[PDB]
Structures are given as C-alpha cells and as structure tokens.
Ligand binder design. Sequence first.
Ligand SMILES: Cc1ccc(Nc2nc(N)nc(CN(C)Cc3ccc(Br)s3)n2)cc1
Length: 275
Amino acid sequence: VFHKIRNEDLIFNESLGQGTFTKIFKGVRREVGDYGQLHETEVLLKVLDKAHRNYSESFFEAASMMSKLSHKHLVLNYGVCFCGDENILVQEFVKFGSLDTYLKKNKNCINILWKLEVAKQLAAAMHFLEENTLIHGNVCAKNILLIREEDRKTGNPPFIKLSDPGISITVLPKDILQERIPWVPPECIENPKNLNLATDKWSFGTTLWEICSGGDKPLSALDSQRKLQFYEDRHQLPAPKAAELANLINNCMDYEPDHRPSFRAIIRDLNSLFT
Ligand SMILES: Cc1ccc(Nc2nc(N)nc(CN(C)Cc3ccc(Br)s3)n2)cc1
C-alpha cells in the first residue's frame, strides 16, 4: 500500500509524452522530509485514466508489488495520488532519463565496458527479482533509467535503475503485444497467460541488443505482420554493432522458455567477458 500524496502537494510543470495508456509529466512534490525540512522534490508523474479500470488496477498493483522490494537498482516510487478521475504514480525524477534516448543523444559514443557495466547492473536487478519470484514483464532500454553518468576521474561507472512494470501484458490488447515484439517473447504472443519469469530473460536479451545498438529499436522496419512472421520462422536478431554480447543475447532469446539461463548464470557470463 503506497503512501498517499495529496493533489494539493503536486505541481505539474511539463508534459513529457505517453507510455502504454499513460500520460507522463515532470513536476514537483511539496513534502516534509528528513528532520522536518520542507522540500520541493522533482518528480516523474505517470497518469492513468480511472475509467480504464482494468489497466489502472494492473498498473498500480505492479508498481506496488515491485516497490515493496527496495533495491539500489529498482526505481523509487514515492507514492500515489488517487487524484479524482485519474490515479497518478509519483516517481523519482531520474536526471538522465531513459537509456535508449541517452545513447542516441550521445551518438553511441560509449565504449563496450560502459555497456557491460550497465548490463551487469540490470542483471543484478533481475536476479533480485528472480529470487523474489517477481515478474517484471516490460524490460526494455526505455525502462532503464540513468541516475548518474560515468566519472572518469573517480572511476565511478554509470548507475542505472529499472523502471516500474506498467500494465501487465496479461491485460493489454494483442495489438499492443505484437507492437512490442521482440521484447514480448514468442510464448506470450501465442498466449499471454504464458507470462513467466522466463519472459524477463527473453526481454533482457532484447534490452542488451538495444544497449549494444546505441538505442536503435530491433525490427523497427517490420510492421506487426512481419514481426509475427519473424517469430514464425524462428529468426534471431542480428548481432548488434558491438558484437561482444551477441552470444548472450541469443542465449537469453531462446525460443524454448525453459532453456533460458538463470540470472545468476547470466551474471557469471557477463563477469567472464574480457577474462
Ligand atoms: C528529457 C528527460 C530527462 C530525464 C527524465 N527523467 C525520467 N525519470 C524517470 N523516473 N523516468 C523517466 C523515463 N520513464 C520511461 C518515463 C518516461 C516516458 C516517456 C518520457 Br518522455 S519520460 N525519465 C525524463 C525526461
């Protein structure tokens, strides 16, 4: 059960765009913080129409269950505003935003070791979720949030978090799942009830492809029908431009869900690259 935030303490400043049946804003939350200090905290606001009751309930149940598992690589949600005809998730505002946009804005002038570090951090988050048997179901590079850039002087690496899960693919329209190929795995295209921890291993592979491809979207040239044929003919993605993780990508994007490796195994594989 999330902390309730009053509409009166939320200021909406910028309209940023949309997610899946959500509207996204930058704003400020007025709050009493540590030592009783009054703060105006920057927040990322995700707004759902309460008339889409099934979507809203799925969205907030997913955010709540994940926010019960505090972890350094899982986004902080401050709470929720049951805000009239809308329900609003109040999330921390991450300074550098989504990783796919970041990589594009930096023109993929990012070395493989940076990419490896981000993959290790995501894998650490996913291992924690796996140990907690919590399915995320929407792993993608847009949901990797960059808290801090690398600092070459100190040797500090970039630092990421994984965003909230959003509406479950067990509730979303089939057309949305197909648009989300190749993040949504083939078994969930066949039947969304096949959602399983194995789903996240597949999507982790697709996410690593995105990271290695500078924020390109795999299969962007394919409409939904060509994306179905992609899975029918059992194709794999092409090796990304930075090919060091291509084997891992393909091992995670296994058409047999039960064969996808555990996140402990994935981490050991990541740790073994470059001796
Ligand atoms: C330009 C800029 C810079 C930083 C941030 N900060 C941020 N903080 C959080 N917590 N999450 C996100 C990304 N998630 C996927 C929500 C969004 C979906 C669509 C958009 Br557009 S933002 N961005 C946002 C915009």
